[PDB]
Design a protein around this ligand. Sequence first.
Ligand SMILES: Cc1cc2nc3c(=O)[nH]c(=O)nc-3n(C[C@H](O)[C@H](O)[C@H](O)COP(=O)(O)OP(=O)(O)OC[C@H]3O[C@@H](n4cnc5c(N)ncnc54)[C@H](O)[C@@H]3O)c2cc1C
Ligand code: SF4
Ligand code: F3S
Ligand code: FES
Lengths: 130, 541, 119, 243
Amino acid sequence: TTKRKPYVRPMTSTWWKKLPFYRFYMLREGTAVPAVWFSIELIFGLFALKNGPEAWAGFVDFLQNPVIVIINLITLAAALLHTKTWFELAPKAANIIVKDEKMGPEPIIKSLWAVTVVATIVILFVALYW
Amino acid sequence: MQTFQADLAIVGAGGAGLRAAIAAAQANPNAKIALISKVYPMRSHTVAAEGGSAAVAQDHDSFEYHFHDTVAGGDWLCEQDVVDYFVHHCPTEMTQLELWGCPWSRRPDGSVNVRRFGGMKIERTWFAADKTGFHMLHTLFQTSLQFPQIQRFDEHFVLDILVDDGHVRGLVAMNMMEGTLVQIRANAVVMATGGAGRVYRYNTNGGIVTGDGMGMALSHGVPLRDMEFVQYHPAGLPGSGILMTEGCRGEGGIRDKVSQAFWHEWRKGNTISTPRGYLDLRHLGEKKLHERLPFICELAKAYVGVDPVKEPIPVRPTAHYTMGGIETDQNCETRIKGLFAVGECSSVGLHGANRLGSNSLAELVVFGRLAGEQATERAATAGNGNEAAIEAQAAGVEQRLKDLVNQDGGENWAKIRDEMGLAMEEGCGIYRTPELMQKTIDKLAELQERFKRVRITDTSSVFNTDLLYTIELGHGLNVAECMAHSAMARKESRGAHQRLDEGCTERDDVNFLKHTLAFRDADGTTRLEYSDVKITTLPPA
Amino acid sequence: MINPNPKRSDEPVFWGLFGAGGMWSAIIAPVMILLVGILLPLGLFPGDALSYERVLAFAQSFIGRVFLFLMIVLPLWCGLHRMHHAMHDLKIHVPAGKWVFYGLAAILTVVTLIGVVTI
Amino acid sequence: AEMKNLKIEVVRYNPEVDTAPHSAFYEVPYDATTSLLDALGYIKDNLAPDLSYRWSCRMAICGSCGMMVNNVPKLACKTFLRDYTDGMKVEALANFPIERDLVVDMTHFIESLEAIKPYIIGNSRTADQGTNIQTPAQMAKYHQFSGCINCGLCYAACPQFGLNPEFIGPAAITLAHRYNEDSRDHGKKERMAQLNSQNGVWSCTFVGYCSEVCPKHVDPAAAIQQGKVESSKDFLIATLKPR
Ligand SMILES: Cc1cc2nc3c(=O)[nH]c(=O)nc-3n(C[C@H](O)[C@H](O)[C@H](O)COP(=O)(O)OP(=O)(O)OC[C@H]3O[C@@H](n4cnc5c(N)ncnc54)[C@H](O)[C@@H]3O)c2cc1C
Ligand code: SF4
Ligand code: F3S
Ligand code: FES
């Protein structure tokens, strides 16, 4: 019979708490929590807006609660980490050759940010100038 | 003693080996081929080559051109009919490789581009960036995978070859992990185990280039041709002996002239003490250093705290290529029916007294193919053998091994190893003297002796490397002695082999235009004989 | 060893949505959080830009309903998706999490639709 | 001159004696040129001849160096003690079944490289015809994926793999994607079945760590990702073939 006895180290559900690289990862894929909470509020407002005029004032006064304010400030910082990481990984799904060379993510990346920038000004422009 | 059956067996999975396996496969589709290697095939030394492989390709070139560049370089000690054969087949192998996916660097045209390497008048060096070795081996290895006939024995260290009545019948090897003895039956074995560059205290070869095979043939009355020739490479880093390529100089990059100059500077006080043995490339610049030497820069920054673009790399010549090997006929076959040696471990009579840059790899794919080919033939022509003799033989192995294990004495094998390398660096160096040469033979025999008082303190079975390095050392000594003796005897100066003593400082085509054969007898003494070189169209002068 | 004829996965579908969701919430989410989550509640805006009257006026416009929908829905599928793999990552057992997570998503899709399809 | 001395720790394990791995400590001399594979050599030679480990190139091209350093997958030959003066722990490659000391069972690894048929397929062109025509541009399409030395380190890095040993693995996929991308190949279909498994490209959550650790800069994460778009593409057509 064989004299081999392979020692298999177990992998724990906390494997990611070790190395910081894993930690930065969890925040990214963990950036989803807030991303929903906001999408939930949206729905509350969509419905709240339609429900009633007086139900609206209550709505705003709601988000007017110190707690709800903070949570969103958070949800926003999260919405940027996400936007930040997402823009860095995206380029990698593409294989583009420019004159015998596979161009990097620096050309795609920098240009995604631009669009993003252009958007905000618009959304903000249309949103507050009329 | 578990028994495995196969048609033909091959020890070693480098470029030459795998090429040998694949053709056998292509040669006989119903074949059961056993491929063995003490390391998974991708870690074979071939993976280290950076220059490129040669093959006539440009329109203004010719075979007679290649041919001439080869004999010329081998200082006329080349078996000219073998060179012919070799040359006309490089192109065909080099195309099969591309055809198998090998990313040969290309032309803007879409065709395969060639470079100038090894100081050949006309370039014919095919290349894949400066990772040619890597790419050839992997393409080879990966190509092989598609063949069911090829049965692999990864990390199986070969102890010995079964031979009876002048004919090979198989081999013993150790399942490295399980630690057992496997006994393989075949009517032809091909042997490509790679060079003996690890023998020197200073080399470029991987830790597996111990030249076991070479030693494995010696025990069986086979000679090792032109072992006195060692090709030293110009740039070698301390301890690691990590190479610094040649193409650097064609481009303003900054020979027994400098070699010699620093070497005899050691006796008058004219050498400039450094930590190891200045390569200044500062002026080089990014584009050329990272396109041709991305490897050269990372091993320098790594092992010496020196960035090839910011500081000079401390170096001194180290051993690189072992030309001599098992004596072989034009079909890569040895004096033992069914026993072929292909690759660097052999001596097809291709390189003579000095291998031409980029011809090694070519050889691999070129003779590798033939090596497998002729094996398959002699394979179905072998006929049966006296089973009792074969089986009685395998026992001599399991026994000799036991005897080896039980051996005691307190000698640290690792210390011996050092001393031997240390002796080689001094007596079989760029410049050999009857004086220093003698000293090394003596040292060498002395160690052979001590090898008998070595104790292997490790008795475990799962992947026991303490035991293997020892067995490897075993072969190291043996071969190392042919080199020495061979060298001492060649009282002349040829290609690789340069002496400084009166009446030997120059090439003598009158008395030494012959081959060197070292035989190791049961008595333990190395005997030398001499053979003659086959001339065809290019006589010496 | 390794299955010679593996089970073709359906992941591409969810990765498809997830992919688009993540790209939209990357570009548009920030500003949305911005106006709605901070500017509006603190009244930091000109006259009646973010007041019920004009808001509704936008909400009922075609480009408005469409936008709201994606704005809400889209992120959902990108987010809820991750949250689902969050389990595995954390070696967390969730009974039919596939359904729970995805299901939840399919639910608010329709709900959100209802929200905007009505007015 | 004189030289420093560094205390180094190694997770030994003998399947014939030990029941589970246990740490060991050796005193090793070193300098700015001293590497870990060189540090390992030292010990076996003077402190414990039973220390086993895989190596050979001594130059980060062989890919047999795979091992753990402070919970980081690295190549001993390309690892230097000058950087670990504050402690150095070396264990057998992460996410693999230790067989003995630092030598690990590479069977699944190889299994993977084999299961994806890593070879040119269906190209009738033969030796005589001459070489296939491939421009640098076509060659850049897959050049990068090709620098793989089968070192083992990406597996030791991807958590998805550690959780799921049924995962063919990054490098595996990479290798495949290489050949898919090579204009000279026409065997993409022969590889898709594995690539589209739950253990294919879809076991990846794109943590982007394997690309962060490859010692040859292959950027597998990219390959895998690019591979997703491929399989994600395949899946589509498939939903469309009532043929
Ligand atoms: C750093 C470096 C760069 C080089 N660059 C070039 C170049 O640019 N161009 C050129 O033409 N040449 C070059 N060469 C020379 C050439 O690469 C080699 O001569 C050639 O690769 C040797 O290949 P091989 O097939 O004979 O076997 P190797 O690649 O050395 O393989 C030998 C095989 O045998 C196995 N083996 C050994 N002992 C045993 C045992 N006892 N049991 C089981 N298996 C065993 C090994 O595991 C291995 O698989 C270079 C050499 C070095 C060291
Ligand atoms: S993917 Fe890269 S780092 Fe991983 S084994 Fe392959 S070559 Fe090494
Ligand atoms: S980090 Fe791991 S998750 Fe996939 S993208 Fe690389 S193998
Ligand atoms: S031991 Fe050669 S690749 Fe590290």
